[PDB]
């Protein structure tokens, strides 16, 4: 017949390599398709839907885990104190694990693009206030006071008829992509720190509660991409199922 030769790479089974394979059933014809609403074509339009961020993840909320979604604001006695602080990278273990962006970034290794963080006020109609939300590029720890944290990319938000505000976390990096940050050598890919502060106080009249809560949402922008699919760390199988 035709003279051939066998190179290396013969009789191996590579899992991620597509090819033609022999069918079992000649002459089959599947069931015709029906128009079902809500078809996806890409994983990038699930990473744009915003989900709740667990900023208030303390060790005392492990017994009543519904407290972990809302962090409080209240009437302050001193001017310029801070309310919360957390890191701004979706791969690291922290507040971003509860989002659909933080779970789909897990399956991939490197990411790119800018994010967004949407805060929503859930107080009464008669309570007013102003708060400062700042984002700090890497190189430092949590800032010590309000006069230091305002040098970053910040926004000033007041409570009115529109209850929400949006802080974009712009893509400031040296490399084109970023692997997942981690303690050790992989702190080179850190993103920054988001802290919110008190611009003015939380003023309330007579006959209204003096503690309100804030929900924080998070999504991705248009230029968000991911690559290098891998395995995830969030599911374990110690013993067999069933």
């Amino acid at each position: 017949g035709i003279p051939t030769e066998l190179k290396p790479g013969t009789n191996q089974f590579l899992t991620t390599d597509d090819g033609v394979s022999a069918p079992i059933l000649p002459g089959f014809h599947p069931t015709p398709p029906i128009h079902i609403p809500g078809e996806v074509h890409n994983l990038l339009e699930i990473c744009r839907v915003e989900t709740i961020l667990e900023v208030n993840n303390l060790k005392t909320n492990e017994t009543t885990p519904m407290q972990r979604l809302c962090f409080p604001v209240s009437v302050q006695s001193k001017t310029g104190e801070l309310c919360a602080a957390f890191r701004a990278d979706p791969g690291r273990d922290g507040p971003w694990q509860s989002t659909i962006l933080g779970q789909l970034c897990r399956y991939y290794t490197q990411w790119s693009g800018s994010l967004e963080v949407t805060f929503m006020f859930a107080g009464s109609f008669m309570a007013t206030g102003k708060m400062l939300i700042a984002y700090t590029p890497p190189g430092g720890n949590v800032p010590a006071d309000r006069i230091t944290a305002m040098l970053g990319t910040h926004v000033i938000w007041d409570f009115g008829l529109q209850s929400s505000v949006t802080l974009v976390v712009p893509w400031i990096s040296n490399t084109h992509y970023r692997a997942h940050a981690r303690a050790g050598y992989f702190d080179y890919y850190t993103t920054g720190i988001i802290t919110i502060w008190y611009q003015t106080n939380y003023v309330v009249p007579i006959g209204a509660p003096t503690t309100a809560y804030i929900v924080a949402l998070a999504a991705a922008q248009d230029n968000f991409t991911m690559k290098l699919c891998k395995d995830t760390e969030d599911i374990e199988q110690t013993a067999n199922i069933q």
Partner: antibody
Amino acid sequence: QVQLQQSGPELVKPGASVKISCKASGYEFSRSWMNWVKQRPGQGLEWIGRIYPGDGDTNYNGKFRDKATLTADKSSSTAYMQLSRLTSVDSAVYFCARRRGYFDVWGAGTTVTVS
Amino acid sequence: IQMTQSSSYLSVSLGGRVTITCKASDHINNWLAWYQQKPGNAPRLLISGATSLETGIPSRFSGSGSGKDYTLSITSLQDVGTYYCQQYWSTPTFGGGTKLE
């Protein structure tokens, strides 16, 4: 180690003035309000007012307005209080506190009598 | 806002578990302090925020208050002196006093 040190006792004529001083040492003198508390010898406490030595704004009680004047020297770390037109009601002891909140550290106390 | 501290001149006996009460008039929102004073001395602030202790104070003092009526309790006596109370919600006002035996 915060230290608040006052002056000594005074014997004053009715109708004259007096200047009590309070000296702070051991911490940053600015960025902290300084309070003055009056205690007439038989009964409880009364709040006179406060002073912010960073710029110099002062809040007073309603009754003690145009009786007391609060001033603060930022360089010498000393806050003064001057009382004017003294009468025999104002024989008391005056303290020096520091929080703007709930009066963390207190002074020793200066006894003022008038006769 | 006027603080009452309606009871003075109490009677204790050396481990008697006394409690001291005061009430405000217009809804102070748990912003009290409790101020033990000895004779011939400056007062010391035993508690801040109506629940929280400072450093160096032994943990036999404890305070609480539900809506308007606030309490201060001692467990093992001797600790004899005059006790005041002070709100900081609009302007600092003090209480009357509480002498013990």
